[PDB]
Design a protein around this ligand. Structure first.
Ligand SMILES: Nc1ncnc2c1ncn2[C@@H]1O[C@H](COP(=O)(O)OP(=O)(O)O)[C@@H](O)[C@H]1O
Ligand code: BEF
Lengths: 102, 110, 147, 88, 50, 76
DNA sequence: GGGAGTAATCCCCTTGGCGGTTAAAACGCGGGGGACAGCGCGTACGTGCGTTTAAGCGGTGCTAGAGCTGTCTACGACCAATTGAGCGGCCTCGGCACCGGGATTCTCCAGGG
DNA sequence: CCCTGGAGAATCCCGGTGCCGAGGCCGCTCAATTGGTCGTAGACAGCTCTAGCACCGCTTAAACGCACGTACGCGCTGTCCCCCGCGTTTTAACCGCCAAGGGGATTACTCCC
C-alpha cells in the first residue's frame, strides 16, 4: 500500500485523502502526503518515550493517564508549545513554597 | 461506652490534632488524587435544572455531562493556584476575596 | 443492547436431563419412584451413626437436634451439600453450634468461618455463641467506615 | 472509520514495545494527531493566502514558522527523508 | 530522559534491596513458629476463652 | 440548584488547590463565578445543539463550546 | 398438503413508593493560629540644579533588494481498479485494584542529664 | 534546655485474590498510485524602481551626578478575630416487592399457494 511505498509506519493515503477533502487552498501540492504524518509520528514517539519512562518510574507497566500528564507537563518545551489543554484525570506536579514548609 | 460493648469503652481518648500538620498531610494526600471529587448526580441534577430555561426536551448524554464536569473541575483548580499565590505574595496565608479579585483582574475576565 | 448483553449465558446440560420427563414420562417416572424408594433407605442408612462430639459445648442437644446433627456430619464427611428445613423455635442455631463444636473437637481444623444473617440477628447469634460453645473466638462487624 | 489504532500500536512497538496501553489513551493520541494536523494545515493555508497560489516546501515552512526549531529541524530532516523515499 | 532512566534504575535497585531484606524477614518469621495446630494446648485456649 | 457544589465539596476542592487556611466568606463569590461559567457553557451547548436542531446534547457540543471559549480541554 | 395475522407465552420489565441501611452535609467551640494596628528607621528616589550630548533636523547621490512584466515548462487536477492497511467480534491471563505486614524514619510526649 | 526511649504510623513493596484487555484470528473491504492528459501557474530572464545607507554637522535636550530630605515597607512590638478538628445529627440513594402490561412470532385456525 502507501506505507510500504513511502517506507513509513503511519498511513498517509488516508491522511492525504483527508487533506484533499480539506481543500485548504487552490494550490495543494500532493508530492508530500506524509510530511505532517512524519512530524506527528516524531512528536508522538518522543511523547511515548517520556510516558514510558514515567510509567517505568512508578513500577507501572501500563500507562496511567496521570503518567501521560506528568510526561507532557515535565518539559519546558512541551508546556510552552501547548499549555492550555486540560487532560482527563488531572493532578498538577507536586510543588511547595519556602514559606509553607520549613 | 453507650451500651453493651467489648468490655470497657472510651478507647477513642482525647487525641485532638492541632492544625497545620493536619492541613499539610491532607493537602499532600489530596494533590495525588486524580479522579472526580464532587458528586456527579447532584451535578447532572443542577445542569438539567438550569437547561430547561433555554428549552425543554433537550435531552442529554453521559458523555456530555462527563465533559462538562471535566471542564468545570479542571478550570477552577488553576484559579485556586493563582489565588493561593496571590495570597501568599501578601502577608495573608489565609484566603480573602482581595487576592481572588486580583486574580480575576489579571487573568482577563473579559 | 441490554437483552443481547444478558443473553450471553445460555444453558447446555440439563436440557437433555429434561428429556427423561417429556413424552409420556418415558420409562422414567417409574425410575423416579424407584429412585425415591432407594434414597429413602440410603438416607435412613448412610451415616446415621450416632457419633457426636459432646465436648466444648455447654448444655445438651435435644432429641431432634441430636437426630439432625448427624445429617450435617454426613454432609461434611460425604463431601455433600444440603438445605435444612425446620419450623422456627427448634434451634437450628444450636445445631450449627454443635456442628462447629464437633468440627473443633473431633477434627483438628477450626478455620475462619463466615455467617450471613439479618441485621437484627447478629446479637442473637453472638449471645447464643456466648451461652453455648463459648470456646470459639468470635468477631463481630459494626461501624464499616472505621471500626 | 479509518482510525490510527494500528499506526499507534506500531509506534508503540517502535518506541517502547514492552509498554501496554489503557482503553482511552488511543483516543487522546488520535486527537493529538488530527488536531495538530488540522491546525498546522490551517496556518499553512492562511500563510499561503497572501501569496498567489492556484507540497513539501509549504508544509516545511509552515512547520518552521510557528512550531519550535528544536522540533522543526527534525521535522525538516524527516520530511526530506520521506519525500526522497517517495521519489525513490 | 537519561536522568529519568538512571532515576528509574536506582529506584529498581532500591526496590530490589527492599525485596531481598523483606523476603529474608518473611522467611525467618515463617520458620520460627509452627504451633497453632497441636490439639493439646487447644483445650487450654478453649478453657481461657470460655 | 444553588447548593449543587456544597460546602464540604468546595472545601475539599480548595484543599486540593493548595491553600493553608480557607476563610468562611470565600465560597459564595466562587460559587457565583462558577455558576456564571456554567450558564455560559450550557448556553453555548444548547446553541450548537440547535446547529442541526439535534434533540440531544453530546460531548461534541460541549467540547465545541469549550474549544471556542478559549479554555481548551483534553482527555478525549 | 403447507405457510401467515390472530390468540397466547415467553421473561423479565416496567411501574412507585416503600422499609432498611450505611455514606455525606450541617451543626457547636477552646483556643489558637491568623490577621491587624503602632512606632521608628533608613535609604533611596523627587527635584533643582551646572554640565556635556546624541537623536533631530534638511538635503543628497545614488543602489540593492523589491515590484514587476512575458512565458513556458515542472507540476497541480485528472478518473479506472485492485489487492492491501486496516477495521470489526472474541477471547484469553496477568497489570492493575485494594487492603494487611512490618522497618525507617516523621513526629510528639515523658523523662535524663 | 539537647538527647534518648517509646509509641502511632506513612511509606514500600510484597503479597493475594479477581478481573477484564491487546491483539490475534477470521471476514472483507475501501481506497493510492499507477496511467495518462488538461491546463496552469510559478520561477527563469528583463526591466526597473525607489526610498535606504550613509553621509554631510550644529543644536537643543537626554545623560547624568549630587545634596536636601523625608515616605513608608518592614524590623520589632502589642492587640486580638474566627479557621479547624472532635463529637452529633439529618438527608440519600440503593437493594429489593409487589403485580399488571410487553412484545415478535409462528404455529391452531382459516384463507392463500
Ligand atoms: N436448644 C434450644 N433452646 C432454646 N431455644 C432454641 C434451641 N434451639 C433452637 N432454639 C430456637 O430456635 C430458633 C432458631 O430459629 P431458626 O434457626 O431461624 O429457624 P427454626 O425456627 O426452624 O429453628 C431460635 O429463636 C432459638 O430461640
Ligand atoms: F423455621 Be426456621 F426459622 F428455620
Amino acid at each position: 500500500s502507501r506505507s510500504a511505498k513511502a517506507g513509513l509506519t503511519f498511513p498517509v493515503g488516508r491522511v492525504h485523502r483527508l487533506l484533499r477533502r480539506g481543500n485548504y487552498a487552490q494550490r495543494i501540492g500532493s508530492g508530500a502526503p506524509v510530511y505532517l504524518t512524519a512530524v506527528l509520528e516524531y512528536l508522538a514517539a518522543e511523547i511515548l518515550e517520556l510516558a514510558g519512562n514515567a510509567a517505568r518510574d512508578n513500577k507501572k507497566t501500563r500507562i496511567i493517564p496521570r503518567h501521560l500528564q506528568l510526561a507532557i507537563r515535565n518539559d519546558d518545551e512541551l508546556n510552552k508549545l501547548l499549555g492550555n489543554v486540560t487532560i482527563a484525570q488531572g493532578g498538577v506536579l507536586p510543588n511547595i513554597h519556602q514559606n509553607l514548609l520549613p | 461506652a453507650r451500651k453493651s460493648a467489648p468490655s470497657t469503652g472510651g478507647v477513642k481518648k482525647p487525641h485532638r490534632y492541632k492544625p497545620g500538620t493536619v492541613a499539610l498531610r491532607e493537602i499532600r494526600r489530596f494533590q495525588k488524587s486524580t479522579e472526580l471529587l464532587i458528586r456527579k448526580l447532584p451535578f447532572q441534577r443542577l445542569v438539567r435544572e438550569i437547561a430547561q430555561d433555554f428549552k425543554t426536551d433537550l435531552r442529554f448524554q453521559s458523555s456530555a455531562i462527563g465533559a462538562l464536569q471535566e471542564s468545570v473541575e479542571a478550570y477552577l483548580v488553576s484559579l485556586f493556584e493563582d489565588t493561593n499565590l496571590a495570597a501568599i505574595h501578601a502577608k495573608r496565608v489565609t484566603i480573602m476575596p482581595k487576592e481572588i479579585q486580583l486574580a480575576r483582574r489579571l487573568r482577563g475576565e473579559r | 443492547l441490554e437483552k443481547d448483553q444478558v443473553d450471553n449465558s445460555a444453558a447446555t446440560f440439563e436440557r437433555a436431563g429434561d428429556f427423561v420427563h417429556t413424552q409420556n414420562e418415558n420409562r422414567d417416572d417409574i425410575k423416579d419412584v424407584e429412585e425415591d424408594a432407594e434414597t429413602k433407605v440410603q438416607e435412613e442408612q448412610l451415616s446415621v451413626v450416632d457419633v457426636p462430639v459432646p465436648s466444648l459445648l455447654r448444655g445438651n442437644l435435644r432429641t431432634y437436634q441430636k437426630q439432625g446433627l448427624n445429617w450435617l456430619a454426613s454432609l461434611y464427611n460425604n463431601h455433600t451439600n444440603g438445605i435444612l428445613a425446620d419450623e422456627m423455635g427448634l434451634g437450628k442455631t444450636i445445631q450449627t453450634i454443635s456442628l462447629l463444636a464437633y468440627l473443633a473437637c473431633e477434627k483438628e481444623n477450626w478455620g475462619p468461618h463466615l455467617i450471613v444473617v439479618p441485621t437484627s440477628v447478629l446479637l442473637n447469634w453472638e449471645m447464643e455463641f456466648k451461652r453455648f460453645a463459648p470456646g470459639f473466638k468470635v468477631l463481630t462487624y459494626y461501624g464499616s467506615p472505621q471500626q | 472509520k479509518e482510525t490510527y489504532s494500528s499506526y499507534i500500536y506500531k509506534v508503540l512497538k517502535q518506541t517502547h514495545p514492552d509498554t501496554g496501553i489503557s482503553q482511552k489513551s488511543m483516543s487522546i493520541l488520535n486527537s493529538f494527531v488530527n488536531d495538530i494536523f488540522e491546525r498546522i494545515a490551517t496556518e499553512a493555508s492562511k500563510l499561503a493566502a497572501y501569496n498567489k497560489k492556484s507540497s513539501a516546501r509549504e508544509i516545511q515552512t509552515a512547520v518552521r514558522l510557528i512550531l519550535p526549531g528544536e522540533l522543526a529541524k527534525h521535522a525538516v530532516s524527516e520530511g526530506t527523508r520521506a519525500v526522497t523515499k517517495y521519489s525513490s | 530522559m537519561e536522568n529519568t532512566m538512571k532515576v528509574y534504575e536506582k529506584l529498581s535497585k532500591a526496590e530490589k534491596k527492599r525485596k531481598i531484606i523483606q523476603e529474608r524477614i518473611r522467611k525467618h518469621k515463617e520458620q520460627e513458629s509452627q504451633h497453632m495446630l497441636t490439639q493439646e494446648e487447644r483445650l487450654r485456649i478453649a478453657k481461657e476463652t470460655e | 440548584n444553588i447548593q449543587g457544589i456544597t460546602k464540604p465539596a468546595i472545601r475539599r476542592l480548595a484543599r486540593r488547590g493548595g491553600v493553608k487556611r480557607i476563610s468562611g466568606l470565600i465560597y459564595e463569590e466562587v460559587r457565583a463565578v462558577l455558576k456564571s461559567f456554567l450558564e455560559s457553557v450550557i448556553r453555548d451547548s444548547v446553541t450548537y445543539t440547535e446547529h442541526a436542531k439535534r434533540k440531544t446534547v453530546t460531548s461534541l457540543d460541549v467540547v465545541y463550546a469549550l474549544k471556542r471559549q478559549g479554555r481548551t480541554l483534553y482527555g478525549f
